[PDB]
């Protein structure tokens, strides 16, 4: 059964252009408007001084 909504309306992964992001959203806390899907957050490097907040 579908028990949680996991689509993030209006949110594109900047790493892979997933749209909309399905699953956990990782928003950069330093960039104004930068987001990763989970695969990209675990897979792609960003700015080493930047940190992501998880939005599930
Ligand atoms: Zn992605
Ligand atoms: Zn950033």
Swiss-Prot record:
It is found in: Cytoplasm; Cytoplasm, Cytoskeleton, Microtubule organizing center, Centrosome, Centriole; Nucleus. The chain holds residues 2702 to 2751 of 4834 of the full protein. Interacts with XPA. Interacts with NEURL4. Via its interaction with NEURL4, may indirectly interact with CCP110 and CEP97. This is E3 ubiquitin-protein ligase HERC2. Zn(2+) 1 binds at residues 13, 16, 37, 40. The gene is HERC2. Zn(2+) 2 binds at residues 28, 31, 46, 50. The ZZ-type zinc finger mediates binding to SUMO1, and at low level SUMO2. The RCC1 repeats are grouped into three seven-bladed beta-propeller regions. It is linked to Intellectual developmental disorder, autosomal recessive 38: A disorder characterized by significantly below average general intellectual functioning associated with impairments in adaptive behavior and manifested during the developmental period. MRT38 is characterized by global developmental delay affecting motor, speech, adaptive, and social development. Patients manifest autistic features, aggression, self-injury, impulsivity, and distractibility. Sumoylated with SUMO1 by PIAS4 in response to double-strand breaks (DSBs), promoting the interaction with RNF8.
């Amino acid at each position: 059964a579908r028990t949680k909504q996991t689509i993030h309306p209006g949110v594109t992964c900047d790493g892979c252009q997933m749209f909309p992001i399905n699953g956990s959203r990782f928003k950069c806390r330093n960039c104004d408007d930068f987001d990763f899907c989970e695969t990209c957050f675990k897979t792609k490097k960003h700015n080493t001084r930047h940190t992501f907040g998880r939005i599930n």
